[PDB]
Amino acid sequence: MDELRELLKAEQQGIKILKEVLKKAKEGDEQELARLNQEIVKAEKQGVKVYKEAAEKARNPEKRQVIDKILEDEEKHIEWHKAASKQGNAEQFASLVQQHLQDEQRHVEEIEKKN
Ligand SMILES: [Zn+2]
Ligand SMILES: [Zn+2]
Ligand SMILES: [Zn+2]
Structure with a gap:
């Protein structure tokens, strides 16, 4: 029971x-x-x-495996939001946010499975 609720x-x-x-x-x-x-x-x-x-x-290693996957994932998210740099991201933005939202919820599933 280590690094669960914390993460x-x-x-x-x-x-x-x-x-x-x-x-x-x-x-x-x-x-x-x-x-x-x-x-x-x-x-x-x-x-x-x-x-x-x-x-x-x-x-x-499996505990690292889960962490490593999300660690890579979480930076990937930032890279996307950073790459935007505000063009005209409103309607386009909301559409992409849905993916981030569903993804982080998937991260919860990747951790808890049944929360
Ligand atoms: Zn994220
Ligand atoms: Zn993700
Ligand atoms: Zn996440």
Whole structure:
């Protein structure tokens, strides 16, 4: 029983921000969007931090395997949001957010399976 609820905290935080991102995506404001983008970057990387930290303390390779997959995943998300750099991301943005949202929920399944 190690690094379970702790790691979920990262996903939970990311998902919680995504909820507001959905709101601001419909709002369509650069300041709100950039600020939220900024929040995402920090939150997801904080997730990477706890995952990477736990990875180097994985009693079982399978525990690292799950962490490593999400660790890679979580950075992938940021890379996408970073690559946007605000073009005209509103309608297009919301569509992509659905994927991030479904993905992090999948991360929960990858961890808990049945939560
Ligand atoms: Zn993420
Ligand atoms: Zn993912
Ligand atoms: Zn995640």
